[PDB]
Each structure stands twice: as C-alpha cells, then as structure tokens.
Amino acid sequence: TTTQSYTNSFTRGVYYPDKVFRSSVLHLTQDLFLPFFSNVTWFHAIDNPVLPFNDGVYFASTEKSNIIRGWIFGTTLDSKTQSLLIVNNATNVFIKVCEFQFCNDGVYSSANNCTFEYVSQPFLMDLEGKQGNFKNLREFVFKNIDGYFKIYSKHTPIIGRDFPQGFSALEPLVDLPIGINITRFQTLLALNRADYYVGYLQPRTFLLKYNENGTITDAVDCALDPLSETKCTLKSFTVEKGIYQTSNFRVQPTESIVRFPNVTNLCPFHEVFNATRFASVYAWNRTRISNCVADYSVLYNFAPFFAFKCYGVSPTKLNDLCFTNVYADSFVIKGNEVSQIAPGQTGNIADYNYKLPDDFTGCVIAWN
Amino acid sequence: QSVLTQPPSVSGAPGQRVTISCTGSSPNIGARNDVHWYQQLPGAAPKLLIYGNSNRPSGVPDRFSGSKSGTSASLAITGLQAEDEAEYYCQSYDSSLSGWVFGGGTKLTVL
Amino acid sequence: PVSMTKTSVDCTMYICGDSTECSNLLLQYGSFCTQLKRALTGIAVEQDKNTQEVFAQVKQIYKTPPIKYFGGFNFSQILPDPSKPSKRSPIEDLLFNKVTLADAGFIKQYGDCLGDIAARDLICAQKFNGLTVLPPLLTDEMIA
Amino acid sequence: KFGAISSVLNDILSRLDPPEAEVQIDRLITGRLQSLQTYVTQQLIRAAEIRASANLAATKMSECVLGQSKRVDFCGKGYHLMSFPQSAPHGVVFLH
Amino acid sequence: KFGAISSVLNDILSRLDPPEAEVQIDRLITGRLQSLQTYVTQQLIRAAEIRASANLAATKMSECVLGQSKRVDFCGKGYHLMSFPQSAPHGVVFLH
Amino acid sequence: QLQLQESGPGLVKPSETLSLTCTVSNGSISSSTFYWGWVRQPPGRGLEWIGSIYYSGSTYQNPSLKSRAIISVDTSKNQLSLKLTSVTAADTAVYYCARHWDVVVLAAARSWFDTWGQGTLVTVSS
Amino acid sequence: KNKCVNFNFNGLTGTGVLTKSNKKFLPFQQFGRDIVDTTDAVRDPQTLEILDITPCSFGGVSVITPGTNTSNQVAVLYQGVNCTEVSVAIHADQLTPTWRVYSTGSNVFQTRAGCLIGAEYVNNSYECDIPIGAGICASYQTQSQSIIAYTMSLGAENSVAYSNNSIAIPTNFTISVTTEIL
Amino acid sequence: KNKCVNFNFNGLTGTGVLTKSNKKFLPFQQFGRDIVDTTDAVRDPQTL
Ligand SMILES: *[C@@H]1O[C@H](CO)[C@@H](O)[C@H](O)[C@H]1NC(C)=O
Ligand SMILES: *[C@@H]1O[C@H](CO)[C@@H](O)[C@H](O)[C@H]1NC(C)=O
Ligand SMILES: *[C@@H]1O[C@H](CO)[C@@H](O)[C@H](O)[C@H]1NC(C)=O
Ligand SMILES: *[C@@H]1O[C@H](CO)[C@@H](O)[C@H](O)[C@H]1NC(C)=O
Ligand SMILES: *[C@@H]1O[C@H](CO)[C@@H](O)[C@H](O)[C@H]1NC(C)=O
Ligand SMILES: *[C@@H]1O[C@H](CO)[C@@H](O)[C@H](O)[C@H]1NC(C)=O
Ligand SMILES: *[C@@H]1O[C@H](CO)[C@@H](O)[C@H](O)[C@H]1NC(C)=O
Ligand SMILES: *[C@@H]1O[C@H](CO)[C@@H](O)[C@H](O)[C@H]1NC(C)=O
Ligand SMILES: *[C@@H]1O[C@H](CO)[C@@H](O)[C@H](O)[C@H]1NC(C)=O
Ligand SMILES: *[C@@H]1O[C@H](CO)[C@@H](O)[C@H](O)[C@H]1NC(C)=O
Ligand SMILES: *[C@@H]1O[C@H](CO)[C@@H](O)[C@H](O)[C@H]1NC(C)=O
Ligand SMILES: *[C@@H]1O[C@H](CO)[C@@H](O)[C@H](O)[C@H]1NC(C)=O
Ligand SMILES: *[C@@H]1O[C@H](CO)[C@@H](O)[C@H](O)[C@H]1NC(C)=O
Ligand SMILES: *[C@@H]1O[C@H](CO)[C@@H](O)[C@H](O)[C@H]1NC(C)=O
Ligand SMILES: *[C@@H]1O[C@H](CO)[C@@H](O)[C@H](O)[C@H]1NC(C)=O
Ligand SMILES: *[C@@H]1O[C@H](CO)[C@@H](O)[C@H](O)[C@H]1NC(C)=O
C-alpha cells in the first residue's frame, strides 16, 4: 500500500555537472536539473508502483534503520530486454546488468546472457549519535546519457522531520558503462521477520556560485522568476538597485488574411454546360475561352460526371493555375466512346472523328 | 487540469494558411518534452497527425506541418479543404503530474 | 549640441528577420552582438548623463516673482510665458519651430503606420527592419 | 545582396534548399554584420564628439551663467556680462 | 568556430588534409582578425576618452592645486579654497 | 491491423461502481513493447487521461482520480478492464481504450497515443 | 483590423497591422511605398479602401528592481508597447524566456515609454531612484512595501523675492570638502 | 616540474610548466578550469 501526496521541493537537487575545479567563480551551466520550487510526488510505505524514468530522476528518502534495499531499472523488467539492479546488501553493492524475469516479492530467477557484475563500497551509509532521532536523509540523482550510468549522492544529516530548505550539493559516486536503455524504474523493500520522495529532471539553465574550495554555496535559476532571469543574465548573485535590460518582447501574428481582387469574370463555361444543342462528334464545336476566371465549381455543380480524368494537370490542382488559353470541345457521344477518347488511343472515333494528341494538357468531362 | 493552453476556435478561407498554437507552463512541461497533435471528427475517435513535433505517420498528408520551440508548439496548414474542419487537440507529458495531459481542444472552421 | 537620439539596435531582429535558421547561423558566429548591444546601451546612458550634467546644475527649482520689473530691463522674451501651455519663452518657441525632426521618438508611432496611407516614413521603415529608438529620460518639457 | 542570389532572406530560404542556401545566408550575415559594426563604430565616434561638446556646454553654463567669466572670448565676443541659456531639441542655445 | 569544423586550430590541422583545411583555417583567420581589429578600434576609442579625462585632470591639478581657480563650479561646488590630490589605481582623487 | 472493441453499460445509477472492458483484435495484449490505457472526454470539454496499465500489473494513474479508478488487465482473454467507483454527475463522458507509451525505445515524455477505440457514450442518471 | 495579422494583399506578402485611413490615393494608385522603399498602404482590392501596415509588435523588456539585499520584489517594463497587446498576447507564446507573466499587481500602468506590469502609479514628487524614461522614476518605498512609479521631481520648490530694495547677505560661513574622481 | 614541458595528462593535451600545489581539490575532482574556460590544474593520475 502506498500514497501519492504532493509536496514542494524548495531549492534541492543541484550537483556538480562536471569534474573540474572552480574557485570563487559564477560559472553557468545548461544541464539536467530539478526545477526550483517544483512539486515532487511524495510516497508512503506500509504495491511498489513502477515509476517512469525520463532524462533522469531525483530520488530522496529518509528511514529509521533500513526499509529500502535498491532500485530496479531497464525496460519491461522481464527476460526479453536487458535490465539493471542496484540492490544494496549489508556492506556491498550488487550493481549488474541482466535479464531478470520476475519475483513479485530471492529477487530474480534468471541470469541468461548477462554480465557486468560490479561490487564496491555500500551506497547507503547509516550513522547514529547513539540515538534514533538522527535520521539521515539520502538523496540520489540518476541519469543515462550516452549509456554511462551516473549516480550522485550525499546523505544530509538534517534530522528528517521535514523536507529541508537548506542547500546540499551532490557528489558523484559511480559512473559505469551500462550501455542499455532505461525507461522504467522501480524500488525494492526489506524484511525483518515519510520517505520515497521522487522528482523528475528537465534541461534547464542554472547559475552556480562555486566556493573557494570547490564546494557549492548557492545557486539560482533563470526560468523561475523575473529576478532570477536578470540575475542569471547579468551573471552575479547580488544585483545592485537599478534598471536592467534582459531580452526582447515579440508577438507573432495571430491570424493570416489574404485578399485577392473582387474579380468574378465568369467564363463561358456555364454557356457550354447549360447549352442544349451539343454538336456531334463528326463536327466537334470548339469554343475559345479567354479573358475570364476559370472557376471549376460551376463545372462541378452543373454535371454529375462519369469520367473526369486528367492527363497534364491534377484535377484537384486547377484553382491555382493560370492558363494562356483554354479550348472546350463539346460533343455528345456514346458510352464506350467516352473511354475511347484519350491520348494514344485508336478506333472509329479516335481516328476518323476526334483524335486526342499524345501530349495533351487538359481534362475531359463526361456526364450522362 | 488544462496545463496546455489552446485557442478556443479559429477559422479561415479554404486553401489558406491557419496556425494552431499550444503552450504550457514552465515548471510543468519542459524543453525536452515533445508535443503531439490529434484530430477528432465529430462523433469519431481522435486521429493522429504529427508526432515528435516534426514527424507524421503513414497516410497523413504533408500539408499538416508542425514545430515546437522551447515550450510553445504550433501547426501550419497549407491548402485548407472542407474535410479539415474537426476538433484538434494538443497533448504532451507533464513531469509534475507524472502523467500525460491534453489541450482544451480548438475548433477549426472552414469559411 | 548636448545629445543625440538614443538607438537600441538589436542584432537578432536586424540581421535575421524571424528566421530560426538565420538565428542559428548567427549563434554559430558566437557572441558578436552582445558587445553591440552593450555599446548601444553605453552611448544611451552617455547622452542621458550629458543632458543631466548640462542642464541640472541647480538643486532647487526657482521661480520668478509674480511681478516682472527688473529696473527697466525687459526680459519677457526669455522668461516663460504662462499663456502658452508649454510654459516656454518665445525664443524657445522659435527654436522649437525652426527645427524639424524626422524622428521625434516620443510619438509611439505604432498605430499610425497602420493608418498612414502615405509613405511609411523613416521611422516606420526603421521599425520595419528591427531598428528602434528610445525616449530621453528628461522629456522636452521638464528641460524647459 | 552583398554577392548572394537575393537580398530578401525570406525569398532565398524558400527558393533554395538549406544545405546549399547556407553559404548564401552566411555571406548575407557577414555583410549585414559588417555593416552593423560600421554603424556602431561611427555612432561611437559621434558619441565622443557629442560628449566633448556637452562638456564644453556644461563648462560654459557653469562659468558664464553662474557667474562672470574673465576668460576673454569665451562667453561671447568682448567683455562679458551675463548669459541666458535656452533649450533646443537635442541641444542648448545661449544669449551671451 | 565562426562557421568552421572546429575552433581548435590544433584539432583541425591534424584532422583534415592541408589543401582543404586551408579554407577552414583561412576563415578562422578572417574571423579572429576581424575580432582583433574590433578590439584595437574599441581600445583606441577608450584611449581617446581616457586622454580627454587625463587632460581635464591635468588642467584641474594645474589650476586648483597650484593656485586658486576663479572659475566657478570648476574646483568643487561653490567658491574654491584649495585642492589636495590623492593617488588611486589608474586614476586620481581630489579633495576640493 | 490492430482493432479495439470496448463495451460497458451506457447507463449507470449514481454512486456505485462503473465498469467497462476493451477487446484487442489482430494482436495480443501480452505485447510487452507497448502500454495500454483509458482516456475519457466529457462532452464539450477536452480529452483527459485516466490511467494506463501494463500487462504485468504496473499501472500509470492520474493522481487527481487516485481514490476512484482501478484498472486491471488479463492476458488470457486479451481483455483490458477498467473500473470506476463513486461515480457522480461530473463523470458523464465517452471512454476510449488506447495503446501508447512504447517501452523499448521511446521515453515517457515522447510517448504518443497511437491506437484509439470507437468509444462508448456512458452517462449517469437518476 | 487593429490586430497583429499576416497579410497577402494582391501579391504583396508581409506581416503587419491595419486600420482605416484618411488620405487621398489617386484613383489609379494601388500600393504604398516611402523614401527608403518600404511598403505602407495597400488599397483594399475588394473595397477600394486604404489600409496600412506596421511592424508586428517590436519591443524591449526591462526589469526595475531595488537591490536584492532589500527585497525580491521586481517590476517589469516593456519599452514602447501598448499594454493591451502584452496582456492579450501572453497566451500562445514561448514561456521560459519572452516572459509570460500573469498581470496582477496594478499592472498596465501605460506610461509614455511603456508600462510597468507590477508597479503602482502615484502622484508625488520624490527624487529619481531608478530612471525609466519619459519622466518616470520608480522607487522601493514602504506602504507594507511595494514599488511605486511617479513623475520626476526636479527639486524642492523655492522662490526668492526680488524686491527693488531687498538684499540678503550671509552672516556665517561653512567649509566643505567634496570629492572628484578622474 | 619547474620546466617548460609538454603534457598529456589522462587525455588533456597542451604545453605548460608544473609545480607543487597547496589548495583543496575535492576527492572527486580531477581537473581544473576557470571563469573563461581554461584548464589550470590536473590531479596527478599516479600520485593524487
Ligand atoms: C503544486 O503545489 C502547490 C503548493 O503546494 C499547489 O498550489 C499546486 O496546485 C500544485 N500543483 C500541482 C500540479 O500539483
Ligand atoms: C554482499 O554482497 C557481496 C558480493 O556478492 C558479498 O561478498 C557479501 O558477502 C554480501 N554480504 C552479505 C550477504 O551480508
Ligand atoms: C547478450 O548480451 C549482450 C550484451 O548485453 C548483447 O550484445 C547480446 O545481443 C545479447 N544476446 C542475446 C541473445 O540476448
Ligand atoms: C531486525 O531488527 C532488529 C532490531 O531493530 C535488529 O537488531 C536486526 O539486525 C534486524 N534484522 C535485520 C535482518 O535487519
Ligand atoms: C577551505 O579550506 C581551508 C583550508 O583549510 C579552510 O580553512 C576553509 O574553512 C575551507 N572552506 C570551506 C568552506 O570548507
Ligand atoms: C441549365 O440551367 C438550368 C437553370 O438553372 C438548370 O435547371 C439545369 O439543371 C441546367 N442544366 C445543365 C445541364 O447545366
Ligand atoms: C459553338 O458553341 C458556341 C457557344 O455556345 C456557339 O455560340 C456556337 O454557335 C456553337 N457552334 C456551333 C457550330 O454550333
Ligand atoms: C517687452 O518686450 C516685448 C517685445 O519687445 C513687448 O511686447 C513687451 O510689452 C515688453 N514688456 C514691457 C514690460 O515693456
Ligand atoms: C536506445 O535508445 C536509442 C535512442 O533513444 C535508440 O537509438 C536505440 O535503438 C535504443 N535501443 C534499444 C535497444 O531500445
Ligand atoms: C466587391 O464585391 C462585393 C460582392 O457583392 C460587392 O458588394 C462590392 O460592391 C464590390 N466592390 C467593388 C469595388 O467591386
Ligand atoms: C541594502 O543596501 C543598501 C545600500 O547601502 C542599504 O541602504 C540597505 O539598508 C541595505 N538593506 C539590507 C536589508 O541590507
Ligand atoms: C492603446 O490601445 C487603445 C485601444 O484602442 C487606445 O485607445 C490607446 O490610445 C492605445 N495607446 C497607445 C499608446 O497606442
Ligand atoms: C493623480 O492626478 C490625476 C489628475 O489630477 C488624477 O486623475 C489621479 O487620480 C491622481 N492619482 C493619485 C494617486 O493621486
Ligand atoms: C518696484 O518698482 C516698481 C516700479 O516703480 C513698482 O511698480 C513696484 O511696486 C516696486 N516694488 C517694490 C517692492 O518696491
Ligand atoms: C557659524 O556656524 C558654526 C558651525 O555651525 C557655529 O559653530 C558658529 O557658532 C556659527 N557662528 C555664528 C556667529 O552663529
Ligand atoms: C601508484 O602506483 C605506485 C606503484 O607502486 C604506488 O607506489 C603508489 O602508491 C600508487 N598510488 C596511487 C594513488 O595509486
């Protein structure tokens, strides 16, 4: 059983994005960070839902002695794609990539085609000053850029009565070439017979004040507040009183209008289409069409065509073309003769009555 | 629960350009998150048009072009036709809610 | 002269009209325009300080007594004339009239380039390309 | 155009394909950037001249207006009595 | 990079052939040479302004320190009595 | 091609459990590569994601409707099951079974809904 | 009209805003241009009315704040922008930069140079602390603390009384030491 | 040390001179850089 309460993260989850030394510098980085003052899903423990894992995850928890063993990573968590496990035992870690099947609870039942076992000093350090009130809060940040799993951690000593507001950096612990994709992320539990904070990272532009000895004192964003923006763009932590110029304010156009002339200039298409005495095929009437706007809707609405094939142009693409001249040859003809009329055809009509040239740029219309 | 903001309605002449925009808050959907676009004919299931902010599935016309910059995302329609009138939806993933979200739905009307 | 019009050129608008590809090409050219913006800001502040130093030499604003008889010396022409709404001297009036500014700057010419019919004059055209001006801090009345 | 197909960026991006229109737009960028550098340098020169004249005007005000200047041919030709400043657009005018 | 393969000259010379990397290194040279010209021009402008201020400081010293200056509002606000110079890093400070 | 058939009582009295179920044809719900989910859309409003569920039993789920929505899956009969309790007048909507959120390669932010059901108009009345 | 729109008038393509017009296009005239060759006015090809063109929304955002040692309260400025536009155009834009802001704190104080979205206007005569432009100066003052905007004051108002037979002569004297740095 | 030498410290290549040091690299720190991004210090990969 678990709950999904929401809490504020304050300023929390800033690490060393690099490995380099800086003293009294105000270096600015653009890396994956947990946004300041972003809500984080606070869980509870008394089954172990599978949380996403996208561009990393911030993990933090507080427990009295031990309730958390490790985390399971990978995709589909089964014997079809490679997996990962960070189970932390008494005094060692069991980092390995494998193809674990399923446990639902002595945690995996398959080790097929898998390697890269790793063992080092334990991740979870527990120290008590002869009292249980000292409940250390352990934070972790995982991410999977170009493989190369990275884990950062620091166990703050601040009681654990509430989520601290003070600043605590994150020192890297391990960096290993895992080499497999990770999308889902679970957690394991313990057995001896107010924790489980989770946040998600997104790319952001921070500003970190490196101390003299390389520690991090304080950091600000430039995606949170106007003050934070000016403080980031005027790189410094103290902004003197005055006016400052940060960026430019634009507005894109909302709607696009086009306006072409009032022209109607209706072609004599109606006259031919609403004609009665259509001349025969042996005397095909050729009507010259010029100095007019060739609207094809008047053609569409006047005849329920049975053959509207086109050769040199697209039947849909006729509104957006301008033609030097248009010729309309109209004749009443039989049924099969309609399909007989086409470029590169033959017959008693295509050879003796009306022949369509091979290089024809136009369309034919046939309606009963 | 509408973390993505959409224009209630829009209209235009057939065969013209219309732009549909979708943006979200800052601590919510971020730069890495991508925005997909869904079309819903009345009384029908929503249909996908653009995913990955620049890619379309098989059968989706190249007329529908979209883009995402920073947080704001938008579509561009060329050669508007009478069949394009539908309910359009923008959707992406909200890192603060750990779950997907959908836009309010914009009304595209052909004039 | 005491100062010139303050210009606030911005590299993105000038060199890449709403084109992300051009913006990326400019970004490839590095920070070649941050110094340009900084220099323009510097000269803007320099004119502001110039006019402040030239004019505001006095801490307390004095006013002439209600009567004006200075031993026969008839200033009038140089003292402010309350009848005029600008509270300016006639010589100031002639100086204002004889000088014609293509760019007044403090007109906020937005709203009339969309109602101008005639030539989109120097100022609307400069706005067209991303070229802006700023209003001086000491407006033309308080200097009087 | 500075040596491109056209001086209209919108026209050239939509008339040629990106990887080859890149050279033309880059040389466009170089031309306009050099012109803007020329503009800012010339404006800095103008700013220096204007600041020199503004310092001269400030000294002239502080001497001739707020007192009598014994400097000959500084506040008007001849022996000097007063000076009444007057305002002007982007400048000042005295009455020595 | 100004629009080259890389901004590291050592990397680019050892990664491409001489006769073709010549274009990239030449555009590198052009970019950095324009940058250096901009630097020297801006520094000349700074030198002109600094020399104007140095002439003003020299005149202020030679008038206010080595004598009393009748010029009103030159050596401090109001009627002037003395002036004690003091040294400062890349500058001077008076006590009018 | 992948088809979805979901059914349920289109009329339910206020305040008890509401239950629908989707059917997958020309495919298998045991397909590990993709997820499966339910999306509801009230009339005159926008789409709303009510939860997604994997074949094993892991469940995506919207925190706003945490205490009312239970989603279950079975691989034997290829059935996607959704339950909703404490239904009130604000839950009138048309429900869809959806397939999305590829696990092998895409991440949880680039996931897009791909397959949609025909929809069932479900209302609550007294 | 009166909205940032995209236009394709009879073959002329650009972006701008439009309204009614009051000059005298000749009957044969169709188009608009200027001294430095920029298109201004396009005759309506379906109304024979004159409409004009303006660059979409150009502006520059600036932040006025007291020292961070004093307060985190800031007021934002948008240079030369009518501030119905900033408010209605907030939606459907980028949000991290190109500031979103929900205009709450006595916003749209439209000045002659822009508008302070986050500052309250007032009629007083304090000295300038943070010059703004067009004779406006903001200052952090206790209300219980907020940023106010007010017109410049050129100094404490004073008036001597020039009288035909009035002389005032100081009876005491002071010595002061200023400082000039060069 | 104390001589104009060429260095290829664990992937970092350049020319310079070296000597002992008296500041406080964190244990995980390996490298050196500055405000304007120039490499200063390299931890000895065989002496720490
Ligand atoms: C985040 O938390 C704040 C304060 O606790 C609350 O006002 C806000 O509604 C929360 N937002 C989300 C998406 O949970
Ligand atoms: C923890 O795991 C290591 C590595 O397999 C093992 O050597 C050690 O004995 C284990 N400790 C236990 C099980 O307490
Ligand atoms: C076995 O694992 C290796 C490395 O994890 C991988 O390259 C290979 O494809 C795997 N083979 C099988 C049959 O799973
Ligand atoms: C169980 O709890 C007891 C008392 O806290 C402790 O001494 C013991 O080590 C625990 N056992 C395990 C396996 O954690
Ligand atoms: C940095 O190291 C010096 C050297 O011992 C020490 O005196 C100082 O306290 C250290 N600073 C911090 C913040 O730890
Ligand atoms: C001709 O016009 C008349 C009048 O509108 C219409 O009733 C008829 O259907 C038309 N026929 C054709 C073939 O266009
Ligand atoms: C051909 O059609 C036109 C248009 O209707 C008509 O004027 C002409 O008389 C026709 N010619 C013949 C020979 O019928
Ligand atoms: C001062 O001169 C002006 C013009 O020379 C004249 O109109 C005005 O009456 C004069 N004032 C007095 C008090 O004589
Ligand atoms: C892992 O992800 C990368 C990029 O997201 C992709 O190219 C690759 O095919 C993926 N591999 C697997 C096994 O999913
Ligand atoms: C344009 O066409 C419309 C359509 O009826 C008409 O009302 C209007 O008078 C026409 N104007 C001109 C100038 O042709
Ligand atoms: C901030 O600094 C100013 C500058 O002297 C000072 O007047 C003010 O009292 C300071 N405020 C605080 C809270 O330190
Ligand atoms: C801003 O728009 C309103 C609305 O028409 C108008 O009344 C006002 O004059 C405009 N102000 C400026 C400075 O453009
Ligand atoms: C300032 O004065 C104007 C004009 O007298 C008045 O309309 C406004 O209400 C005044 N505002 C305050 C805060 O006194
Ligand atoms: C100064 O002299 C003028 C002219 O005689 C007279 O009108 C005025 O009243 C006098 N003022 C005083 C204060 O004596
Ligand atoms: C002049 O001023 C000084 C300083 O305030 C004071 O000590 C002295 O008594 C004053 N002289 C007279 C005559 O009041
Ligand atoms: C490095 O290796 C040498 C070889 O014996 C050894 O003396 C030295 O202690 C080692 N140092 C480290 C930090 O590994």
mmCIF file of all heavy atoms in Angstrom, chain G residues 25 32 43 56 58 65 109 121 125 138 147 154-155 172:
data_model
loop_
_atom_site.group_PDB
_atom_site.id
_atom_site.type_symbol
_atom_site.label_atom_id
_atom_site.label_comp_id
_atom_site.label_asym_id
_atom_site.label_seq_id
_atom_site.Cartn_x
_atom_site.Cartn_y
_atom_site.Cartn_z
ATOM 1 N N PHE G 25 -5.198 58.626 -51.864
ATOM 2 C CA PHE G 25 -4.804 57.806 -53.006
ATOM 3 C C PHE G 25 -5.480 58.287 -54.282
ATOM 4 O O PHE G 25 -6.696 58.495 -54.311
ATOM 5 C CB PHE G 25 -5.209 56.351 -52.771
ATOM 6 C CG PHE G 25 -4.117 55.475 -52.254
ATOM 7 C CD1 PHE G 25 -3.347 55.858 -51.183
ATOM 8 C CD2 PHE G 25 -3.869 54.251 -52.847
ATOM 9 C CE1 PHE G 25 -2.356 55.033 -50.707
ATOM 10 C CE2 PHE G 25 -2.871 53.431 -52.379
ATOM 11 C CZ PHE G 25 -2.116 53.825 -51.307
ATOM 12 N N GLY G 32 1.599 51.265 -51.746
ATOM 13 C CA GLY G 32 2.255 52.251 -50.910
ATOM 14 C C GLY G 32 3.729 51.945 -50.783
ATOM 15 O O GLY G 32 4.151 50.785 -50.789
ATOM 16 N N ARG G 43 -4.296 49.427 -51.098
ATOM 17 C CA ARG G 43 -5.711 49.628 -51.360
ATOM 18 C C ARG G 43 -6.435 48.293 -51.296
ATOM 19 O O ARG G 43 -5.957 47.290 -51.832
ATOM 20 C CB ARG G 43 -5.910 50.279 -52.726
ATOM 21 C CG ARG G 43 -7.333 50.725 -52.998
ATOM 22 C CD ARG G 43 -7.534 51.062 -54.461
ATOM 23 N NE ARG G 43 -6.977 52.367 -54.792
ATOM 24 C CZ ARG G 43 -7.569 53.521 -54.522
ATOM 25 N NH1 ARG G 43 -8.742 53.570 -53.913
ATOM 26 N NH2 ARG G 43 -6.972 54.652 -54.876
ATOM 27 N N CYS G 56 5.106 44.193 -36.592
ATOM 28 C CA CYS G 56 4.150 43.468 -35.765
ATOM 29 C C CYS G 56 4.037 43.973 -34.331
ATOM 30 O O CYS G 56 3.001 44.527 -33.958
ATOM 31 C CB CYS G 56 4.515 41.983 -35.756
ATOM 32 S SG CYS G 56 3.099 40.864 -35.723
ATOM 33 N N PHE G 58 7.212 45.108 -32.160
ATOM 34 C CA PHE G 58 8.559 45.303 -31.628
ATOM 35 C C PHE G 58 8.571 45.929 -30.241
ATOM 36 O O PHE G 58 7.817 46.864 -29.962
ATOM 37 C CB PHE G 58 9.361 46.174 -32.588
ATOM 38 C CG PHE G 58 10.823 45.908 -32.546
ATOM 39 C CD1 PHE G 58 11.311 44.799 -31.881
ATOM 40 C CD2 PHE G 58 11.714 46.787 -33.125
ATOM 41 C CE1 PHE G 58 12.661 44.558 -31.822
ATOM 42 C CE2 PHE G 58 13.064 46.554 -33.063
ATOM 43 C CZ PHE G 58 13.539 45.438 -32.417
ATOM 44 N N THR G 65 14.293 46.883 -10.334
ATOM 45 C CA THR G 65 14.247 46.249 -9.029
ATOM 46 C C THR G 65 15.111 47.031 -8.062
ATOM 47 O O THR G 65 16.116 47.623 -8.469
ATOM 48 C CB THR G 65 14.733 44.796 -9.088
ATOM 49 O OG1 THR G 65 14.614 44.204 -7.790
ATOM 50 C CG2 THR G 65 16.179 44.731 -9.530
ATOM 51 N N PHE G 109 0.121 49.952 -16.155
ATOM 52 C CA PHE G 109 0.310 51.385 -15.962
ATOM 53 C C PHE G 109 1.010 51.939 -17.201
ATOM 54 O O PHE G 109 2.221 52.149 -17.243
ATOM 55 C CB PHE G 109 1.090 51.675 -14.690
ATOM 56 C CG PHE G 109 1.557 53.095 -14.601
ATOM 57 C CD1 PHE G 109 0.668 54.138 -14.784
ATOM 58 C CD2 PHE G 109 2.889 53.389 -14.395
ATOM 59 C CE1 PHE G 109 1.096 55.444 -14.732
ATOM 60 C CE2 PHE G 109 3.319 54.693 -14.340
ATOM 61 C CZ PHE G 109 2.425 55.720 -14.512
ATOM 62 N N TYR G 121 1.126 53.388 -9.897
ATOM 63 C CA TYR G 121 1.340 54.806 -10.125
ATOM 64 C C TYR G 121 0.959 55.602 -8.879
ATOM 65 O O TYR G 121 0.162 55.162 -8.050
ATOM 66 C CB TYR G 121 0.535 55.278 -11.331
ATOM 67 C CG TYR G 121 0.656 56.758 -11.615
ATOM 68 C CD1 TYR G 121 1.898 57.358 -11.760
ATOM 69 C CD2 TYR G 121 -0.472 57.555 -11.731
ATOM 70 C CE1 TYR G 121 2.013 58.704 -12.020
ATOM 71 C CE2 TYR G 121 -0.366 58.904 -11.992
ATOM 72 C CZ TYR G 121 0.879 59.472 -12.134
ATOM 73 O OH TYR G 121 0.992 60.817 -12.393
ATOM 74 N N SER G 125 6.327 63.712 -5.528
ATOM 75 C CA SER G 125 7.483 64.378 -6.109
ATOM 76 C C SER G 125 8.774 63.911 -5.454
ATOM 77 O O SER G 125 9.620 64.730 -5.087
ATOM 78 C CB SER G 125 7.343 65.896 -5.980
ATOM 79 O OG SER G 125 7.829 66.345 -4.728
ATOM 80 N N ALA G 138 10.816 55.019 -10.805
ATOM 81 C CA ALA G 138 10.295 54.071 -9.838
ATOM 82 C C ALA G 138 11.164 54.060 -8.590
ATOM 83 O O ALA G 138 12.331 54.453 -8.616
ATOM 84 C CB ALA G 138 10.223 52.668 -10.441
ATOM 85 N N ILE G 147 6.703 48.675 -4.980
ATOM 86 C CA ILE G 147 7.395 49.514 -5.950
ATOM 87 C C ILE G 147 6.381 50.465 -6.567
ATOM 88 O O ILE G 147 5.365 50.032 -7.121
ATOM 89 C CB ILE G 147 8.087 48.673 -7.032
ATOM 90 C CG1 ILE G 147 9.277 47.929 -6.441
ATOM 91 C CG2 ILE G 147 8.542 49.550 -8.169
ATOM 92 C CD1 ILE G 147 9.129 46.438 -6.494
ATOM 93 N N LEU G 154 12.027 67.858 -10.041
ATOM 94 C CA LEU G 154 13.306 68.484 -10.333
ATOM 95 C C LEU G 154 13.952 69.108 -9.108
ATOM 96 O O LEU G 154 15.064 69.636 -9.217
ATOM 97 C CB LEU G 154 13.128 69.526 -11.428
ATOM 98 C CG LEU G 154 12.299 68.947 -12.563
ATOM 99 C CD1 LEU G 154 11.809 70.035 -13.481
ATOM 100 C CD2 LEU G 154 13.132 67.943 -13.306
ATOM 101 N N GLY G 155 13.301 69.060 -7.963
ATOM 102 C CA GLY G 155 13.905 69.541 -6.739
ATOM 103 C C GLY G 155 12.860 70.171 -5.844
ATOM 104 O O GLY G 155 11.698 70.322 -6.211
ATOM 105 N N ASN G 172 27.208 83.973 8.431
ATOM 106 C CA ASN G 172 28.113 82.928 8.874
ATOM 107 C C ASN G 172 28.622 82.199 7.642
ATOM 108 O O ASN G 172 28.147 82.421 6.526
ATOM 109 C CB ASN G 172 27.416 81.972 9.845
ATOM 110 C CG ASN G 172 28.377 81.316 10.807
ATOM 111 O OD1 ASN G 172 29.527 81.728 10.935
ATOM 112 N ND2 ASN G 172 27.905 80.283 11.488
#
